[PDB]
Amino acid sequence: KVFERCELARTLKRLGMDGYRGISLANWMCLAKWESGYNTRATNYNAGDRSTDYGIFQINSRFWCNDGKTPGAVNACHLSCSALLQDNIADAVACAKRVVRDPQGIRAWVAWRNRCQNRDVRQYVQGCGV
Ligand SMILES: [Cl-]
Ligand SMILES: [Cl-]
Ligand code: NA
Questions:
Q1: Cα-to-centroid distance, 96 and ligand 2 (Å)
Q2: Which residues form the active site?
Q3: Out of 4, 7, 53, 102, which one is annotated catalytic?
Q4: How far, in Å, from the CA of 119 to the mean position of ligand 3?
Q5: Fewer CB near the last or first residue (10 Å), C or N of the chain?
Q6: 98 and 64 Cβ atoms separated by less than 8 Å
Q7: Other CB atoms closer than 10 Å to residue 33's CB: what's the count?
């Protein structure tokens, strides 16, 4: 499923993402935008280390979900990576919450540092009613 901007904003707010571990809703919106373009079925194979990024938040199989083919990987979210490819983002959101519970926080995603950190991210949520 490819979410429309405000539709996603409202969904994330309902799932409790606004201010989760100090991360504003607009930061989550910026992250999803640059990681997948708000596309839940996005997959990205990393030839360099044999891991794959799954779903709307492009969560990596090396540490967060199990896909069985990633060497020396763990499954901290305790989920099959298949769960992060559903149209319903509940599981993806629960896992993202797990990721930011680590000390790096939102910084765990390099794309956030490049395109969201220290920027005016208000644009991602303007006019959505959240
Ligand atoms: Cl699962
Ligand atoms: Cl599994
Ligand atoms: Na894994």
A1: 17
A2: 35, 53
A3: 53
A4: 32
A5: N
A6: yes
A7: 20
Active site residue 35: yes
**Total residue count of the chain as it appears in this document:** 130
Domains annotated for the chain, with CATH where assigned, are: 1-130 (1.10.530.10)
Question: How close is the Cα of 67 to the center of ligand 3, in Å?
Answer: 6
What are the backbone dihedrals phi and psi of residue 39, each rounded to the nearest 5 degrees, phi first? -105, 115
**Enclosing H/E stretch for 22:** none
69 CB-contact burial (10 Å; exposed 0-12 / middle 13-18 / buried 19+): exposed
Q: Is the alpha carbon torsion for 82, 84, 88, 91 positive or negative?
A: positive
This structure was determined by X-ray
| Contact present, 117 and 35 (Cβ < 8 Å) | no
